[PDB]
Amino acid sequence: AKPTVFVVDDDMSVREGLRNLLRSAGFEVETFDCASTFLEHRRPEQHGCLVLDMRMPGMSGIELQEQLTAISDGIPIVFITAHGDIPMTVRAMKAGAIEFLPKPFEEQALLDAIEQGLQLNAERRQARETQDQLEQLFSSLTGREQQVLQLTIRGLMNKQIAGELGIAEVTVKVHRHNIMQKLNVRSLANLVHLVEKY
Numbered sequence: 691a692k693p694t695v696f697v698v699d700d701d702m703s704v705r706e707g708l709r710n711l712l713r714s715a716g717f718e719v720e721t722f723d724c725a726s727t728f729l730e731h732r733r734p735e736q737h738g739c740l741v742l743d744m745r746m747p748g749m750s751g752i753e754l755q756e757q758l759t760a761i762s763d764g765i766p767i768v769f770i771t772a773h774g775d776i777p778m779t780v781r782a783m784k785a786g787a788i789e790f791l792p793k794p795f796e797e798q799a800l801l802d803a804i805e806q807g808l809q810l811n812a813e814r815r816q817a818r819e820t821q822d823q824l825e826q827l828f829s830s831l832t833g834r835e836q837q838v839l840q841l842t843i844r845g846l847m848n849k850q851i852a853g854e855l856g857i858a859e860v861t862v863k864v865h866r867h868n869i870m871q872k873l874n875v876r877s878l879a880n881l882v883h884l885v886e887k888y
């Protein structure tokens with residue numbers, strides 16, 4: 691999807707200033723003056739980075755982050771604050787913080803953090819799509835096929851698999867053919883990689 695920077699900050703100058711900065715850099719931008727309007731619109735499939743104010747009406751920045759943690763939305767966060775004297779908590783850092791930046795911010799520092807965040811989002815999403823794709827491929831196998839797969843990745847020959855399970859060799863052959871097609875692999879090497887991957 692399009693790289694989108696979500697900007698959450700109650701202050702108009704921040705929202706407009708960042709919209710302009712981020713557009714002038716090739717990012718789509720979405721802004722919210724509240725945490726809950728963000729959460730209401732948030733789709734965890736949207737590729738992006740969150741730039742987040744500490745203090746806003748309603749939920750604070752940390753409180754929004756707690757919601758995102760709770761629902762396993764792993765979007766990366768660049769925290770911004772006008773009160774640099776108040777440190778981030780250890781928990782706020784661990785829950786996906788890219789960086790903690792002051793307002794007013796160095797434009798380039800902010801841009802570098804967002805670039806860092808987009809790459810971490812791209813990576814995270816790829817590892818999500820892969821796991822998702824592999825659960826659907828593996829879930830599409832029958833119990834019988836599962837039994838054959840388990841022995842196959844143990845290096846057994848069809849003859850030995852047949853004897854172990856009490857089925858005909860042709861039955862094993864056919865199960866093996868169907869496993870390859872279901873899991874979309876053309877070699878025993880790639881079959882074993884896939885099972886280990888998942």
Ligand SMILES: [Hg+2]
Nearest residue numbers: 723724725727
């Ligand atoms: Hg709002």
Ligand SMILES: [Hg+2]
Nearest residue numbers: 727728730731
């Ligand atoms: Hg809305």
Ligand SMILES: [Hg+2]
Nearest residue numbers: 738739807808
């Ligand atoms: Hg981003």
Ligand SMILES: [Mg+2]
Nearest residue numbers: 700743745746
């Ligand atoms: Mg604020």
